[PDB]
Amino acid sequence: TNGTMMQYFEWHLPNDGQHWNRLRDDASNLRNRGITAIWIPPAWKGTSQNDVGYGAYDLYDLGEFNQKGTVRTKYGTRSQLESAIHALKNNGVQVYGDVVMNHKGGADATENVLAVEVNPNNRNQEISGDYTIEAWTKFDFPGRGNTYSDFKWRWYHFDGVDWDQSRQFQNRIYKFRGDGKAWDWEVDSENGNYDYLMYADVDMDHPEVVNELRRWGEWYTNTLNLDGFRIDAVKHIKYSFTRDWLTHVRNATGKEMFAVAEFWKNDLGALENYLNKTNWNHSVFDVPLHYNLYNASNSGGNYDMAKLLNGTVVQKHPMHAVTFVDNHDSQPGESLESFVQEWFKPLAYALILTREQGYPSVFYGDYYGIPTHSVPAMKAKIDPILEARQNFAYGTQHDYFDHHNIIGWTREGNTTHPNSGLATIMSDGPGGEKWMYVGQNKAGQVWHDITGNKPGTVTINADGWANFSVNGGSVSIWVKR
């Protein structure tokens, strides 16, 4: 059976503490639609109650301590999360936790630290003399005390900050002075060295930090019975640290732990470097495919559809690609805004859901809508595609990426999964037809469009061929009636 992940949040969810409850209520529903794994938002305490969670204050506070002016996170309390996960586990759905280790925000107090300024466009270049700044580096976790962990963070656990509380200049980055203080390596080389991103940057060279993060990893996994991870911001984290952290947590827990890493760069070469340096021990989001889809959706029919997979992770390394259409960063108004246009969106979902390559991810914002911006729920359009993946998308695949508008592929089905087999056909331009092979054994069967976009039927010929059709700017998915 085909695996399907859902990203179960978007940026603009309400701060009503109800999100874990929503997830609990949806557990049977998701299982029935073919969702086999859920990626939950940051579960820990952020810099405030309405923090999406990437301003990660205390990784041991899952909405259970009174810190940052709130007990619950944005999403709910720890006991509410724990019953949502039980509901999921009871329905055979796996749970992936987000993992934010690059930085810590929302320090309890400042410290006076000797620092040097570096060039924001080249963090290898020092551009000032040394001087003392007031840095937000002191974390004591007053609400939690020493429960679960007695580790306290101080300036020397960090490499630098972008904020001097005493002077309050913008567009500065401060590297701390001290013995063996340097930006970590290997990290992405955009801006010279891209170790520094935001908040207080974690020093992955520091042996107490490495030990603390490994131990937090086991604790998080065990406390919540997680089946895997989505790892945040990996281009800004020393590559060998991520590789060995994951191995550690897998060894310590005895579980396989699937992991997908967010390496945000539209560059297949950079992604292959990352995968080589981490020894192929986890997957990456297919960021190049997201940009291909985004650009195709904006090209008004003029994109060359035969080239839709060129330069992508899924084309080259299918077993290490998590495919997606949109996420909380590409949604309107957000940091990496590059939202796939609504008319193309069912085509993009058919591409990732009905081909044999890659591990696909459905976005909450697409499925349930983004009411704050004007994005309607596309549940009605995505559901039949999820049904095709669940029941029909099996067996040998035949690809027809051979025209600038009209492309398609077929699946022959297999003997496990009866009635399985399909022909997907789509056009970014005018409608039309394509001759495609579904298998000699399907001769004489009558097929219909599961999307309901094309009314009518198609009878498979004596040799296993049929002329499948599609409307303009549309997708049809043909299966046995």
Ligand X SMILES: C[C@H]1O[C@H](O[C@H]2[C@H](O)[C@@H](O)[C@@H](O[C@H]3[C@H](O)[C@@H](O)[C@H](O)O[C@@H]3CO)O[C@@H]2CO)[C@H](O)[C@@H](O)[C@@H]1N[C@H]1C=C(CO)[C@@H](O[C@H]2O[C@H](CO)[C@@H](O[C@H]3O[C@H](CO)[C@@H](O[C@H]4O[C@H](CO)[C@@H](O[C@H]5O[C@H](C)[C@@H](N[C@H]6C=C(CO)[C@@H](O)[C@H](O)[C@H]6O)[C@H](O)[C@H]5O)[C@H](O)[C@H]4O)[C@H](O)[C@H]3O)[C@H](O)[C@H]2O)[C@H](O)[C@H]1O
| Partner whose footprint covers residue 198, from Na ion, ligand X, Ca ion, none (CB < 5 to 8 Å by kind) | ligand X
| Residues in the chain that come right before a backbone break, where C and next N are over 2.5 Å apart | none
CB of 324 to ligand X, least distance (A): 12
| Partner whose footprint covers residue 428, from ligand X, Ca ion, Na ion, none (CB < 5 to 8 Å by kind) | Ca ion
Helix, strand, coil percent values for the chain (each to nearest 5): 25, 25, 50
Q: Is 399 a catalytic residue?
A: no
Residue type, 293: L
CB 130 within 8 A of CB 266: no
Residues 146-165 that bind Na ion (CB under 5 A): 159
| Partner whose footprint covers residue 404, from Na ion, Ca ion, ligand X, none (CB < 5 to 8 Å by kind) | Ca ion
Give the footprint of ligand X on this chain (CB under 6 A): 54-55, 100, 105-107, 136, 162-163, 190, 198-200, 232-233, 235, 262, 264-267, 328-329, 335-336
* Three-class SS state of 289: helix
Catalytically annotated residue among 232, 387, 412, 449? 232
Instruction: Output the DSSP codes for 431-448.
Output: -EEEEEE--GGGTT-EEE
| Partner whose footprint covers residue 54, from Na ion, Ca ion, ligand X, none (CB < 5 to 8 Å by kind) | ligand X
The stretch among 42-50, 184-192, 268-276, 383-391 that binds Na ion (CB under 5 A) is: 184-192
Alpha-carbon span 113 to 137, nearest angstrom: 9
The stretch among 43-51, 80-88, 197-205, 369-377 that binds Na ion (CB under 5 A) is: 197-205
CB of 479 to ligand X, least distance (A): 36
Catalytically annotated residue among 262, 326, 366, 449? 262
Q: Which is nearer to ligand X, 198 or 224 (CB)?
A: 198
Q: Which residue has the tokens 């007695």?
A: 150
Integer CA distances (angstroms), 210 to 140, 202, 404, 481, in order: 19, 10, 50, 57
Alpha-carbon span 95 to 217, nearest angstrom: 15
Q: Does 428 bind Na ion (CB under 5 A)?
A: no
Q: Which is nearer to ligand X, 202 or 388 (CB)?
A: 202
Q: Which is nearer to Na ion, 10 or 159 (CB)?
A: 159
- Label residue 178 left, alpha or beta by phi (over 0 means left) and psi (-120 to 50 means alpha): left
Q: Which is nearer to Ca ion, 310 or 457 (CB)?
A: 310
Crossing angle between the packed helical segments 78-90 and 19-32, to the nearest 10 degrees: 10
Q: Is 16 a catalytic residue?
A: no
Residues that bind Na ion (CB under 5 A): 159, 184, 195, 201
Q: What amino acid positions are annotated as catalytic residues?
A: 232, 262
